[PDB]
Structure 1
Amino acid sequence: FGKRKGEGFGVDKREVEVLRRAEKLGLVTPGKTPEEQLKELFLQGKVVLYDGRTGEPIEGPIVVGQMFIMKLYHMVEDKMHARSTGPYSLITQQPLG
């Protein structure tokens, strides 16, 4: 936040709205300054987030952060079947191959 506060920006209108709703939610304390409200939110792991596809702020603070995620040994291409007509067996006419 200090980066922004210095850079020549501040509490966005959207952030203001989100804070206003967060008050009625009961995460922030009523009475402090927008910066302090955002501080309280940032303490609980939560933070303002924008929709992205609209620019309308997600009315309600949500928790963001970097967690650890692996990719599991299974994939999709390992398990993929889509044959209509193909090989059968001489021993049994049920299709496989």
Structure 2
Amino acid sequence: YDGRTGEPIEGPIVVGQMFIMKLYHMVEDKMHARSTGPYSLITQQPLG
């Protein structure tokens, strides 16, 4: 049953228990943004 409507899904759907893992790649770690910041010595371009 669709919890939004209450109406059934128009077809029977495969449901069961699956083993699913949370991998080491998490947004908290990867989100990054910069306006201005450190520059490199010789090139004076932003660091990495």
Tell me the number of residue pairs that the alignment of Structure 1 and Structure 2 aligns.
48
Q: What is the CA–CA distance in structure 1 between the aligned matches of 2:34 and 2:5, rounded to whole Å?
A: 42
Superposed CA RMSD in Å reads: 1.6
- Separation of aligned partners in 1, 2:47 and 2:20: 37
Greater than 4 Å deviation, 4+ residue runs? none
Shift of 1:88: 1.2
Specify which structure has the higher proportion of helix. 1
The structure whose RCO (Cα within 8 Å, separation 6+) is larger is 1
- Give the Cα separation in 2 of the matches to 1:91 and 1:80: 28
Query: 1:61 matched to which residue of 2?
Result: 12
Task: Compute the displacement of 1:72 (Å).
Answer: 0.8
How does the TM-score come out when normalised to structure 1? 0.44
Q: Unaligned regions of 5+ residues in structure 2, if any?
A: none
The structure whose residues are more often strand, as a share, is: 1
The percent identity for this pair of structures is: 100
1:92 Cα deviation (Å)? Answer: 2.1
When normalised by structure 2's length, the TM-score is 0.77
